[PDB]
């Protein structure tokens, strides 16, 4: 196949599994010092999808608005994905609780998730792929990359 | 207090 072949299949690919919400081949668990994280209950290779990153999909000015909010509520955790798409800014925010397991994946510089940006007829959306072949058993992991002095300082876990 | 997900 050409290489515009095989970027038409896999474009394919993502859209149907966006469109079906389908999140197979993992599972939640209690991961020591992190919470819920989400493992793996089967491999996956390298290039794979993963999951979406599915949640409220915002701009600007709602987000800001969100997070004015949520501040104040110290039992609301971290959910707000934030990207730049045609010059715009945009969130994911993924802070109400649901079934959907993008929202429960954990933090790591050295992950095997990478997320990119995959747009359906001028609609964002943020997948996760694997980055490496995943192992059966272990947690899926992606780099959240807030690396702001300020997060660092209260979640030192971001470091690394 | 709070982190962010800022896509890289
Ligand atoms: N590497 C890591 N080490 C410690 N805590 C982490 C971590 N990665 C993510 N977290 C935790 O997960 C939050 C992001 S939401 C990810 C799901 C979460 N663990 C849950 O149980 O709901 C972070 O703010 C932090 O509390």
Redesign the interface.
């Given at each position: 196949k050409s290489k515009a072949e095989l970027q038409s299949e896999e474009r394919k690919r993502i859209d149907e599994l966006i469109e079906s919400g389908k999140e197979e081949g993992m599972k939640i668990d209690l991961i020591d010092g992190k919470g819920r994280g989400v493992i793996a209950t089967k491999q996956f290779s390298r290039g794979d999808f993963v999951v979406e990153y599915h949640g409220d999909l915002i701009e600007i000015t709602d987000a800001k608005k969100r997070?004015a909010l949520?501040?104040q509520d110290?039992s609301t955790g971290?959910?707000?994905?934030?990207?730049?798409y045609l010059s715009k800014t945009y969130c994911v925010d993924a802070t109400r609780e649901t079934n959907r397991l993008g929202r429960l994946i954990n933090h790591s510089k050295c992950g095997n998730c990478q997320?990119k940006?995959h747009d359906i007829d001028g609609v964002p959306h943020?997948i996760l792929i694997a980055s490496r072949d995943i192992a059966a058993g272990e947690e899926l992991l992606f780099?959240?990359?807030?690396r702001?002095k300020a997060?660092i300082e209260?979640?030192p876990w971001?470091k690394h | 207090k709070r982190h962010r997900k800022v896509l890289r």
């Open positions: 997070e949520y501040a110290p971290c959910y707000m994905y934030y990207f730049q997320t940006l943020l780099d959240y990359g807030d702001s997060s209260a979640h971001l | -």
